[PDB]
Amino acid sequence: LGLTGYDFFWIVPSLVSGNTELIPKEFPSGLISVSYDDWDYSLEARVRD
Amino acid sequence: GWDMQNVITLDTSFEDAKTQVQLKKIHSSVILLYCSKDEAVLILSEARS
């Protein structure tokens, strides 16, 4: 429909961007999303907390 | 004024591909259609869809 491009910013919750290792080919680049951090917040720190 | 928004030429494969993208950018306006009757049937069915 021409709703995706440089001038359109699709912002989505963690619901659609879950399992960041699996990215569908229909997700436009620049798809802003918010999610719980699994990179810097390590599991050892999680257990300690 | 004559704000002719766009000119669309459906070469072939009205329902297959490459025609839905063109037909989806037509907004609320007057659509001058030039084709044959047996082909206007298909074009208008796709437009309703």
Q: Which positions in chain B have a beta carbon within 8 angstroms of at least one beta carbon in chain A?
A: 24-25
In chain B, the residue whose alpha carbon lies closest to the alpha carbon of A1 is B24
Q: Which residue has the tokens 């699709």?
A: A10
Is A37 among the annotated ligand-binding positions? yes
- Helix, strand, coil percentages (3-state) for chain A, rounded to 5, are 10, 10, 75
Method: cryo-EM
Q: Which residue has the tokens 């257990």?
A: A47
The kind and range of the H/E element at A11 are strand A11-12
DSSP 3-state assignment of A32?
strand
Q: How far is CA B10 from CA A12, A16, A23, B36, in A?
A: 35, 35, 33, 12
d(CA A19, CA A9): 21
One-letter amino acid of A6 = Y
Is A38 among the annotated ligand-binding positions? no
For residue A31, with 0-12 CB atoms within 10 Å meaning exposed, 13-18 middle and 19 or more buried, which class applies?
middle
